Structure formats: structure tokens, C-alpha cells
Structure 1
Amino acid sequence: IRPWWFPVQELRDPLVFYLEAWLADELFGPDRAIIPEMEWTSQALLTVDIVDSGNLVEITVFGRPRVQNRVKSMLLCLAWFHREHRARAEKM
């Protein structure tokens, strides 16, 4: 269901990038309830699903390409922080 404030035209040509399943559950939560809030604050449309045997999650971002890059970079930085914290905890 397309939100009313998101134009229909921007749906075309989305950006797709992959991440790990545990990273997805850390970022968006197991219930994925935080997706609409990030969608609004970033002004882009997101889809989260696990597509590779439960190991790899696919994320699709809808919107203008600069907004796509900004959202992708923020998500990658958050995932990198989670990776660093997890590695430090496991080494401990």
C-alpha cells in the first residue's frame, strides 16, 4: 500500500542491496515495526525480506537516487556499528 505522501512516479527503478538476517533483526527488529518511521524521516519506501535460505536479507529502497544512497549509507553504517559491537562482544 503506497503512502499518500509518496508520489507514485518515484516507485520506478528502485535500489536493491543485501544484508545479513541477524543484522536485519538487530536494525529493524524482529517485528519490523520501525520501518514506517524510518521511511517517513528518510522520505523513501523500504521492503525487508529474507531471500537466501534464511541467511541473507534483501532490502529495496524506493525514491529519488540521492535519497536512496543516503538511506543505504545510513543502514550500512548502522550495520557496521552492529558488526563491530558483535565482534567485540564475541571476542570478549
Structure 2
Amino acid sequence: PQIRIRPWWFPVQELRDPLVFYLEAWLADELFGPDRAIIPEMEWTSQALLTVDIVDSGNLVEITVFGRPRVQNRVKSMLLCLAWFHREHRARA
């Protein structure tokens, strides 16, 4: 059982059919920061709710997106592109 705050403007209907994909732990660390203080702003600008969790082994991070399917696909593509930028930046240095 996991309990999460949800805003008043996100309708309960859209909570159905979430989207799940995994990324690396450290990579999520530079994307969101150790504090995760930017998620509310990203949620408001995208009108979609995210959730970041860490597996016990600490290798994989599970990301879930709430919203209409086109919004979920768009957000997934954006995050994957940023992940590739950070991976290639790490490879450069």
C-alpha cells in the first residue's frame, strides 16, 4: 500500500490505465535531483501526475504517468530524450 497526495484539479477518472517504464537510478538522480523539488511544477505545466520509486537493489527506477494516452506518450518521449542527453554527457566526461 502506497499513499500519495493528489491535487484537486486532476479528475479521478484519468487515474485509470497508467503507463510504466524503467530508467537507471543515478540517471533519475540527476534528472529529478535528490530532493525531487521540481515535480509539482512539472505536473502543473504538463497537467499530468508522475511518481518516482527506487527498487530495493537500487539499480532500477520505476516511473508511472497518469493522464490521457497521448499525454503519457509525449511525456515518455521527452524524458527518454533527456535521459539520452545525460547519458551522452556522462560519456563525454
- Using structure 2 for the length normalisation, give the TM-score: 0.92
SS at match of 1:85: helix
Aligned-partner Cα distance in 2 for 1:48–1:88: 27
Shift in Å at residue 43 of structure 1?
1.1
- The runs of at least 4 aligned residues of structure 1 exceeding 6 Å deviation read none
Task: Report the identity percentage.
Answer: 100
Shift in Å at residue 68 of structure 1?
0.4
Aligned-partner Cα distance in 1 for 2:14–2:76: 16
Aligned-partner Cα distance in 2 for 1:37–1:79: 19
Aligned-partner Cα distance in 2 for 1:15–1:52: 21
- Count how many residue pairs are aligned between Structure 1 and Structure 2: 89
Shift in Å at residue 2 of structure 1?
1.3
1:70 corresponding residue in structure 2: 74
Shift in Å at residue 52 of structure 1?
5.3
Aligned-partner Cα distance in 2 for 1:11–1:77: 25
- Using structure 1 for the length normalisation, give the TM-score: 0.93
The correspondence for 1:9, drawn from 8, 13, 30, is 13
1:47 corresponding residue in structure 2: 51
1:20 corresponding residue in structure 2: 24
- Can you give the 5+ residue segments of structure 2 that lack an aligned partner in the other structure? none
Which string of whole-angstrom CA distances, capped at 9 and with x for unpartnered residues, describes residues 9-60 of structure 1? 0001100000001111111100111111111111111000112510110000
Aligned-partner Cα distance in 1 for 2:29–2:66: 21
SS at match of 2:55: strand
- Can you give the 5+ residue segments of structure 1 that lack an aligned partner in the other structure? none
